[PDB]
Amino acid sequence: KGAYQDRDKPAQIRFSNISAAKAVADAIRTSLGPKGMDKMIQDGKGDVTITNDGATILKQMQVLHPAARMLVELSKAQDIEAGDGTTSVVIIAGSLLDSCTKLLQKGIHPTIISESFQKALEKGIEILTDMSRPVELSDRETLLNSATTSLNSKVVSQYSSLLSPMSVNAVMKVIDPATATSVDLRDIKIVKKLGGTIDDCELVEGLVLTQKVSNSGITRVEKAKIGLIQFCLSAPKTDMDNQIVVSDYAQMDRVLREERAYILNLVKQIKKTGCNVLLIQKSILRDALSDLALHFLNKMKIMVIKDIEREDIEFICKTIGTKPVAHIDQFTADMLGSAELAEEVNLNGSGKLLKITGCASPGKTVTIVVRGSNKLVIEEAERSIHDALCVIRCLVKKRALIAGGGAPEIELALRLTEYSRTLSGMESYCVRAFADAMEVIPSTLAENAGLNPISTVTELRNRHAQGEKTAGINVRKGGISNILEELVVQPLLVSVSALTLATETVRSILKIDDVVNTR
Amino acid sequence: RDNKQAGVFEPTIVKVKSLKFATEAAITILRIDDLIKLHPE
Amino acid sequence: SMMDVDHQIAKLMVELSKSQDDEIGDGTTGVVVLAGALLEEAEQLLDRGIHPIRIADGYEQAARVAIEHLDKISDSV
Amino acid sequence: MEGPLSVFGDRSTGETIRSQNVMAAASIANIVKSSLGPVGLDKMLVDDIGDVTITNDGATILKLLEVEHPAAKVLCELADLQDKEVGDGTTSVVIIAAELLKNADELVKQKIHPTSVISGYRLA
Ligand SMILES: Nc1ncnc2c1ncn2[C@@H]1O[C@H](COP(=O)(O)OP(=O)(O)O)[C@@H](O)[C@H]1O
Ligand SMILES: Nc1ncnc2c1ncn2[C@@H]1O[C@H](COP(=O)(O)OP(=O)(O)O)[C@@H](O)[C@H]1O
Ligand SMILES: Nc1ncnc2c1ncn2[C@@H]1O[C@H](COP(=O)(O)OP(=O)(O)O)[C@@H](O)[C@H]1O
Ligand SMILES: [Mg+2]
Ligand SMILES: [Mg+2]
Ligand SMILES: [Mg+2]
């Protein structure tokens, strides 16, 4: 007879948290893998969203249980660190907790479960690293295969032939492949424009803008010199309160004339540089482009795009080599950007786009125009392309590759079962639970593919025991096979981060024993 | 009836775009296997 | 029996315990604990994707085995 | 809610939601089926105030209607897109999308995987 444990509310709270987490995992289990399908989510306001992304799904369904909220945060963290695996991580967490259920019932302490899970996690990171193979960023075929694998799960998979080379080109265009240790995907701009179909998506090396051109008649410019204008082309206005007191009839005409002359001098100093395209920043508190200024620019044959946003300035400069000018005195030729063409293109009556293509200083920036027949499919195409970019980012960060099709999970299950048999004690039960929990991804992949999950997962375990550690679920043949022949590869970072973050979240949830309702 | 001799013509773009858009719509709707309708606030 | 249950499966479990009491007069708690455990294990089996009828048939087979083993290890007074 | 998933809303899953989506699309297409071809006829539309609109244009009809289901709003926007990019075919495109949905859901009921149906539709 040990300690009576006079209180049962800690156990009730643990079981409620485990149940909520397992419920979330089982709710999103259907959106896992190439044969997985999407969920539609209608917000309270009525905003519809179709998606296969685990992070998006979890953020959009307003889960209420604390454990479910924590799983949402977990998926968001995985989306940050790897951008791919946001469903696998939640499923792994739910499964580990579902195993904590039977462990707790067996009568193991949550602290022992947590420590044994940390042990199993370290051993599993070891195992996955052993499985991994190095990759060279020059291996364009390996990059294409990683991107295609990442896209196989999404609605944009019939267009993979189009969107994988774009998703690899963008990243290889926005990084120096020899020195890069990461990539900032804010350098990759995505522009969603309704109309056409997803096969109409494009990778624009130059610049794309949704702002409209103010000139009528000047839509196309070749050999374009472009200038950014952070000052206002309108009547003078001091930063102090200013008035112009008229006391004689002559002063009225004089005021109008001097205003005209000010504006004309401005636009003439602009023309004198050879500038034929003029990007004007957006200006509240003062008119950035008066009618006189527009008249004069048009007469001088200059295309004008105003209302540029103060956040697109760094992007536009990074793209087309311009330097932002805030005083007309400093507006010279060295502050311009040279572009072989700048045109306002129409998209089959579905809107207009300003495309600045060709650049003498195309500095590590690219744009992707996402087309589509519906807002929903456009949004999910954007999300999938982002997932592919993040997969390439993982590959850049950690130059290591792991097989797919549930091969890493199966190898993990197997080797951690062995580790458990070697770690005799009460840690053995917990490590075996960790292994059988990691066995849920292959089961889910099989179920979604339409196979018999038990037989499929047993065949996988058997072949991995024989030694085919690169063996997985071939949804094309309908059974098990060497998955590298199907070219299903993913960065080691995805699996490693998924395992690490899921284990940390599980230990956190296991360290909880009560719930209070504040206020 | 021979509609080319009867004069019943449609621009190719009509049928082509109709097919492409209809297929895209069918694909997007068919990809949905779940629905979560949140209670408004 | 004193429990004011609304769930129909809980009503089935009440009937199960009452049946054990009618037939035997003892074991009314063992039957319920064991049935709950069997269903809890069927839960994990269903997660792995086995047909619930296959689960029920495996349970019937194992129950026959256990009954025969009871007859085997039994003693007499 | 009653289920373990504590989301504050309703949840449809599987053949239920697939049949519902197909029902919505079919509803939208059956609205406009009667206005197709040289023998199609026009429709009145009354805007709850006595505002009357006579029309044969499927895009116009689906813009004037007040649709609540998202799988039917999808087809309404499809007709709008057809009107923007082509200018004709706004009814045929909706009819064809709905029929593709019908047959594809029939296949999914026969348990052909929706990915396979989608690949076949893309190829076709
Ligand atoms: N063509 C394929 N064949 C077999 N398995 C695949 C294929 N494409 C992807 N997978 C598997 O599907 C998983 C990716 O599913 P996904 O929907 O992206 O979930 P997550 O977002 O959690 O990665 C990976 O574990 C990968 O092994
Ligand atoms: N003195 C004892 N030592 C060990 N086990 C016992 C003892 N008395 C009863 N048990 C066990 O307790 C279990 C539960 O029986 P109990 O709950 O008393 O009756 P019921 O199950 O009909 O309510 C029985 O399986 C029996 O083997
Ligand atoms: N004179 C005709 N004889 C036979 N079919 C016709 C004739 N005119 C039009 N059609 C058919 O009617 C269909 C669409 O009719 P309509 O409703 O006017 O166009 P929309 O699809 O733009 O609504 C087309 O597929 C076309 O083949
Ligand atoms: Mg993925
Ligand atoms: Mg007794
Ligand atoms: Mg017509």
Three-state helix/strand/coil letters over D63-90: HHCCCCCHHHHHHHHHHHHHHHHCCCCH
**Whether D75 contacts B25, CB under 8 Å:** yes
Q: How far apart are CA D98 and CA D100, in angstroms?
A: 5
Angle, alpha carbons D108-D113-D115 (nearest 5°): 115
Active site annotation includes A470: no
Tokens coding A45:
């306001």
A312: helix, coil or strand? Answer: coil
Calpha distance A287→A304 (Å, rounded): 15
Report the alpha-carbon distance of residue A506 to residue A18 in Å, rounded: 9
Respond yes or no: is residue A53 known to be catalytic.
yes
Taking the C-alpha atoms of residue D77 and residue A378, their distance in angstroms, rounded to an integer, is 13
Q: Write down which chains contact chain C via at least 3 CB pairs under 8 A.
A: A
Distance CA A331, CA A349 (A): 37
Q: Across chain A, how many H-helices and E-strands are there?
A: 16, 17
| Longest distance between any two alpha carbons in chain C, whole Å | 46
Contact A66, A485 (CB under 8 A): no
Task: Work out how many CB contacts closer than 8 A connect A with C.
Answer: 16
Nearest atom (ligand 3) to Cα of D58: 23
> Among all chains, which residue has been given the structure tokens 């959009």?
A60
Please identify which of the residues A56, A87, A148, A503 carries the catalytic annotation: A87
C-alpha span between A178 and D15 (Å, rounded): 51
* C26 Cα: distance to centroid of ligand 5 (angstroms): 5
The amino acid at residue A152 is: N
User: Strand, coil or helix: what is A241?
Assistant: coil
The answer to whether A383 and A370 are in contact (CB under 8 A) is no
Chains that touch B (3 or more CB pairs under 8 A): A, D
Q: In whole angstroms, what is the distance from residue A116 CA to residue A437 CA?
A: 14
> Could you give the CA distance from residue A296 to residue A262 in angstroms, rounded to a whole number?
12
Taking every pair of Cα atoms in chain D, the longest distance, rounded to a whole number of angstroms, is 55
Please give the structure tokens belonging to residue A484.
């590298």
Enter the tokens of residue A258.
Answer: 């001097």
Q: Is A387 a catalytic residue?
A: yes
Q: Is A149 in the pocket of ligand 1 (CB under 6 A)?
A: yes
List residues forming the annotated binding site of C for ADP: 27-29
3-state helix/strand/coil string of A275-306: CCEEEEECCCCCCCECHHHHHHHHHCCCEEEE
Report how far residue A433's alpha carbon sits from residue A52's, in angstroms, rounded to the nearest whole number.
29
- d(CA C43, CA D107) in angstroms, rounded, equals 30
The rounded Cα D53 to chain-centroid distance in angstroms is 22
Residue D38 near ligand 3, beta carbon < 6 Å: yes
Instruction: Describe the crossing of helices A88-106 and A66-81 by its angle, rounded to 10 degrees.
Output: 140
Beta strand pairing status for A277-281 and A303-308?
parallel
- Residues 36-55 of chain D whose Cβ lies under 8 A from any Cβ of chain B: none
> Is the CB of C49 less than 8 angstroms away from the CB of A454?
yes
Beta partners for residue A209, in sequence order: A354
Contact A218, A298 (CB under 8 A): yes
Experimental method of this PDB entry: cryo-EM
CB A441 within 8 A of CB A91: yes
CB-based contact A443 C48, cutoff 8 Å: yes
Q: With an 8 Å Cβ cutoff, are A443 and C50 in contact?
A: no
d(CA C35, CA C21): 15
How is residue A330 written in tokens? 């400093």
**Please, what is the Cα angle at C71 between C66 and C73, to 5 degrees?**
90
Residue A195 and residue D84: Cβ atoms within 8 Å? yes
Residue A31 DSSP code: G
B1/chain A closest Cα distance in angstroms: 34
Residues A288 and A234: beta-carbon distance below 8 Å:
yes
d(CA A121, CA A114): 10
Size (chain C), residues: 77
Q: How far apart are CA A68 and CA A24, in angstroms?
A: 6
Is A41 close to B28, i.e. CB distance below 8 A?
A: no
Contacts of A152 (CB under 8 A, 6+ apart): A34, A160, A488
- The structure tokens listed for A230 are 């952070």
Strand order in the sheet with A133-134: A133-134, A400-403, A489-491
- Per the rule left: phi > 0, alpha: psi between -120 and 50, beta: everything else, D111 is left
C-alpha angle A38-A385-A377 in degrees, rounded to nearest 5: 45
Cα separation of the two ends of chain C? 33
The pair of structure tokens assigned to A205 is 């090396």
Of D115, D116, D94, D114, whose CA–CA distance to D105 is shortest? D114
Residue A185, classified by CB atoms within 10 Å of its CB into exposed (0-12), middle (13-18) or buried (19+), is middle
For residues D124 and D121, give the distance between their C-alpha atoms in angstroms, rounded to a whole number: 5
The alpha carbons of chain A give a radius of gyration, in whole angstroms, of: 30
Residue nearest to atom 6 of ligand 1 (CA): A405
Q: Check if C20 has its Cβ closer than 6 Å to any atom of ligand 2.
A: no
- Strand (E) or helix (H) holding D32: helix D15-32
* Amino acid type, D61: I
DSSP-derived secondary structure letter, A470: T
**Helical (H) or strand (E) element with A489:** strand A489-491
Q: What is the DSSP letter of A346?
A: E
What is the C-alpha separation between D64 and A481, in angstroms, rounded? Answer: 54
Cα–Cα distance measured from residue D117 to residue B31, given in angstroms and rounded to the nearest whole number:
10
- Pocket residue to mutate for ligand 2, from C19, C24, C26, most atoms within 8 A of Cβ: C26
CB A199 within 8 A of CB A159: yes
Distance in Å, CA A34 to ligand 4 centroid: 9
Tokens, residue B35: 């629905």
d(CA D35, CA D26): 15
Min distance B11 CA to chain D CA atoms (Å)? 9
Cβ-contact D107, B20 below 8 angstroms? no
Give C-chain residues touching A457 at CB under 8 angstroms. Answer: 48
Distances (CA, A) of A149 to A33, A107, A442, A483, D105: 10, 42, 16, 11, 27
Burial (Cβ within 10 Å: 0-12, 13-18, ≥19) of residue D103: middle
Strands A366-370 and A202-204: antiparallel
Q: D37: CA distance to ligand 3 center in Å?
A: 4
CB atoms within 10 A of CB B27: 26
The torsion defined by the Cα of A505, A511, A513 and A516, in degrees rounded to 10, comes to: -60
Continuous H helices in A198-338: 249-271, 291-299, 313-320
Residues A187, A174: contact at Cβ < 8 Å?
yes
Catalytic residue among A56, A86, A319, A365: A86
The whole-angstrom separation of Cα A450 and Cα A352 is: 44
Residue of B20, B21, B38, B41 to mutate, interface with D, max D Cβ within 10 Å: B21
Cβ neighbours of A41 (radius 10 Å)? 24
